[PDB]
């Protein structure tokens, strides 16, 4: 009721500093690998009575090239994300100069609040995150190859290598769980690697949609 | 397209071989002149076989690239396997 | 003279394995003048062999008495003096392998040749020195003669 | 299930690029089978530095 | 041996750098622990 | 040994490790997936939709790869890697499952 | 190096694998085509194995290009044979296993 809730958090925390990580974000290498035990010794052993809140769990990296480029990590206490959380944490990012955000959620998000999450995005690019895909890191499975993602310039070599327009490679959906983990959006390309038992080693490449 | 760099495979595919001696053979027959000598040859097909292995065929293979340009190969230019 | 191997062999065994073709028998032999093993095919149907037999064997890579290579077609209508009058039972194959004993570092103290008369098949094994005259995919003769 | 295999799959082609392509020119296999080769010249070997 | 010595410094350097990135991650984290503050 | 656990000894061996598995009668891969002492890297699924729904569009291209090739070679048969792959391509290269339909 | 990536490649231990060009069979009509005595020391030097490898690694162009790009499609889609290849043509096999000259 209570250990599982605390492993649960720090499994969730694991996951989402790896995707910090594989993002580009600043990820020291001592949180990147924390024993269930040193969370409990940084955070608590008993979320339920209130050692730790989920408020306490709040990350906040910086993106390796741009310190300025920062992104939060919260976890709303409630299941179910009302809008009004949603304005609270719009309300904090504008407070702390941050344009980025991911909310994990326990049961899930109201629709207004996702619609909330769609019309502001380019003002603030947040995302949501159930906790239940965040107890593993999808990028660690077998079927899922490696994937990178791509800059403008290479993009731009890429189709000037191929003599091809964009909308000629193949796609990858915006919502696909691996183009969620690395939180890219329309217009974006990916390159795939994925070992080949013909050829060794092949590179896709799947564009954003 | 820079006919300096071609990007195609120096190779004659199976398609080019078959459709430039089929082409070829169809001249022949509608009385084209042979660039070959010839023994005793009469079948336009045998004599189109022998002016590809002479490398002697007046055809330019255009092959068109996805983007649209094309490449042109004289047959001659091309690597003839079978 | 063109001869690579001679000795006498014993029939030491015949089919230890059971009879596997049956006008074709394997001999398990052994000779006396160098100890040499002999794992021989004939057909038993034409050239009966019996167990204990003694028999002198001689791989040639000629028939012509004379040193003179031949050309490995088939030629009745020839008159020369043939080392195959002499013998009995005349086989002609080729040589399909040469193991040995040899080392990284250390040459064949014992090499055991593997010759196919049209897939009837021999291994000659012993000594190293006595299959010098041994190379691989080289045409040799049976030449082999029942003595009492 | 022939049919539908075949009218889903029937325009795509290698090109003169060795992409792989359909009849919209979507680029399916950057090379075919991942290596460019025919399946006809290829065979059984076995990998002697692996086990 | 000299080669190994070497290798063996560059292995020291590098641990090092080690050091220097993790004591670099506790400046930036004596930053990240007032805005954590403020958060709640 | 494609159900075993293969590992490589220390010595460089490939060694087959004999070790429990698990085969439901349901799939719930994104629960089963997160569950202590279950592995999270090699838990797999059948059932291709959830796959694409759990791990996305290159993953459900490797796993349809995998279970045409079962249905292929479970009668001992044999079909060259390539037509497995181009027609795995045809149903993923829009960034949906494309149903041959 | 090679090794490796074989490793990573076929978590499996499985060596089968389907290629262009059957070297074994290659090296095998090579020894009969020129008569090579197993038992005799070779003629052919080692750096000339290395060497023509690498020569011939450049010759077998799948992708073709200069730039990096290329450079890498063409690196990947070689990998597995070039990797068979360097196995198979290495100085030490070429020296003690096939005696070539």
Redesign the interface.
């Given at each position: 009721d209570d250990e599982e809730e605390t492993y649960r958090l720090w499994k969730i925390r694991k996951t989402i500093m790896q995707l910090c990580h594989d993002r580009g974000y600043?990820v020291?290498?001592?949180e990147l690998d924390q024993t269930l035990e040193e969370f409990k010794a940084q955070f608590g052993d008993k979320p339920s009575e209130g050692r730790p809140?989920r408020?306490?769990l709040?990350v906040?990296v910086?993106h390796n090239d741009d310190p300025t480029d920062q992104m939060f990590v919260f976890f709303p206490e409630e299941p179910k994300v009302g809008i009004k959380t949603i304005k609270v944490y719009c309300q904090?990012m504008q407070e702390?100069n941050i344009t980025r955000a991911l909310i994990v959620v326990q049961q899930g998000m109201t629709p207004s609040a996702k619609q909330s999450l769609v019309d502001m995005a380019p003002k603030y690019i947040l995302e949501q995150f159930l906790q239940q895909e965040l107890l593993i890191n999808i990028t660690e499975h077998e079927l899922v190859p490696e994937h990178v993602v791509m800059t403008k310039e290479e993009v731009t070599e890429l189709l000037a290598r191929y003599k091809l327009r964009e909308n000629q490679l193949p796609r990858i959906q915006a919502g696909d769980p691996v183009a969620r983990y690395f939180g890219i959006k329309r217009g974006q390309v990916v390159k795939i690697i994925r070992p080949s038992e013909t050829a060794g080693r092949y590179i896709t490449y799947r564009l954003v949609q | 397209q820079a006919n300096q760099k071609r990007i195609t495979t120096p190779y004659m595919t199976k398609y080019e071989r078959a459709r430039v001696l089929g082409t070829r053979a169809l001249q022949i027959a509608m009385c084209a002149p042979v660039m070959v000598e010839l023994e005793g040859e009469t079948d336009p097909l045998l004599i189109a076989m022998k002016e590809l292995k002479a490398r002697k065929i007046p055809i330019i293979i255009r092959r068109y690239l996805p983007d649209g340009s094309y490449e042109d190969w004289g047959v001659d230019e091309l690597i003839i396997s079978d | 003279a063109g001869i690579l191997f001679e000795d006498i062999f014993d029939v030491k065994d015949i089919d230890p394995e059971g009879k596997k073709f049956d006008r074709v028998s394997r001999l398990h032999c052994e000779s006396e003048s160098f100890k040499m093993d002999l794992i021989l095919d004939v057909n038993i149907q034409i050239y009966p062999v019996d167990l204990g037999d003694k028999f002198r064997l001689v791989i040639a890579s000629t028939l012509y008495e004379d040193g003179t290579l031949d050309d490995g077609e088939y030629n009745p209508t020839d008159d020369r003096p043939s080392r195959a009058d002499q013998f009995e039972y005349v086989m002609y194959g080729k040589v399909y392998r040469i193991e040995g004993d040899e080392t990284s570092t250390e040459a064949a103290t014992r090499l055991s040749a593997y010759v196919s008369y049209g897939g009837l098949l021999m291994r000659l094994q012993g000594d190293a020195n006595n299959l010098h005259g041994f190379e691989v995919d080289s045409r040799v003769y049976l030449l082999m003669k029942k003595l009492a | 299930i022939q049919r539908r295999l075949i009218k889903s799959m029937e325009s795509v082609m290698v090109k003169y690029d060795a992409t792989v392509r359909n009849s919209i020119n979507q680029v399916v296999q950057l090379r075919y089978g991942e290596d460019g080769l025919a399946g006809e010249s290829v065979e059984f070997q076995n990998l002697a530095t692996l086990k | 041996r000299q080669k190994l010595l070497k290798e063996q410094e560059e292995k020291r350097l590098r641990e090092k750098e080690e050091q220097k990135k993790?004591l670099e991650?506790r400046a930036?984290?004596v930053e990240?622990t007032k805005?954590?503050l403020m958060?709640? | 040994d494609n159900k075993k656990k293969i590992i490589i000894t220390e010595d460089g061996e490939f060694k087959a490790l004999q070790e429990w598995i698990l085969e439901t009668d349901g799939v719930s891969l994104m629960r089963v997936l997160s569950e202590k002492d279950v592995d999270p890297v090699r838990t797999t699924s059948n059932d291709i939709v959830e796959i694409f729904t759990v791990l996305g569009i290159e993953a459900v291209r490797k796993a349809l790869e995998r279970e045409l090739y079962h249905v292929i070679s479970f009668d001992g048969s044999y079909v060259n890697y390539r037509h497995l792959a181009l027609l795995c391509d045809t149903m993923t290269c829009r960034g949906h499952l494309m149903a041959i339909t | 190096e090679d090794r490796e990536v074989l490793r990573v490649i076929f978590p499996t231990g499985d060596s089968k694998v389907v290629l262009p060009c059957n070297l074994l069979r290659m090296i095998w009509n090579a020894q009969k085509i020129f008569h090579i005595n197993p038992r005799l020391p070779s003629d052919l030097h080692p750096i000339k194995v290395v060497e023509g490898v690498k020569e011939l690694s450049k010759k077998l162009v799948i992708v073709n290009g200069d730039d990096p790009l290329s450079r890498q499609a063409q690196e990947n889609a070689t990998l597995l044979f070039n990797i068979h290849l360097r196995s198979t043509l290495c100085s030490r096999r070429m020296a003690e296993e096939f005696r070539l000259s």
């Open positions: 600043l020291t290498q001592d809140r408020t306490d709040t906040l910086a904090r702390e | - | - | - | 993790l991650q930036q984290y990240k805005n954590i958060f709640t | - | -």
